[PDB]
Write a protein that binds this ligand. Sequence first.
Ligand SMILES: [Ca+2]
Ligand SMILES: [Ca+2]
Ligand SMILES: [Ca+2]
Ligand SMILES: [Ca+2]
Ligand SMILES: [Ca+2]
Lengths: 143, 18
Amino acid sequence: LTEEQIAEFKEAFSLFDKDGDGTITTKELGTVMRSLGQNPTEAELQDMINEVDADGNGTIDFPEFLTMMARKMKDTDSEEEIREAFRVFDKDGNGYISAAELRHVMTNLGEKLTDEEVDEMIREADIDGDGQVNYEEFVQMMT
Amino acid sequence: FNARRKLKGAILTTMLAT
Ligand SMILES: [Ca+2]
Ligand SMILES: [Ca+2]
Ligand SMILES: [Ca+2]
Ligand SMILES: [Ca+2]
Ligand SMILES: [Ca+2]
């Protein structure tokens, strides 16, 4: 891994962490995934957190989250995880995440940020300079 | 605040939740 790779993962830890206390439970998984329109089962929640649990205690701190992001589990009928995530952002499915829709996604995840910041983010991912973020640019900022 | 890492962090949390 690298400085920047570890830097993305700190931020992905922070969004699940809800009540603070630097740990993630099966509850924070289930809750944040249901706000993104998913519906986990109690058995499959426990198939995720207790897999990377260690040290006992029942929660996941950042060392654990960090190991998970490298030594992950394998997949089943999955392949296009970038189109599935893109689909979650691009509310009206025209293929272009507007600055407006990015603000909608961040507030549902709990982030209260400046308009200057909302557009700063669009401008980081906007390869062609049209003012919005499309799919072929989303895939590339991932890859 | 860091714009490139706020967007990246939220994209990976969405991928993890999906
Ligand atoms: Ca927590
Ligand atoms: Ca643990
Ligand atoms: Ca759109
Ligand atoms: Ca456009
Ligand atoms: Ca663009």
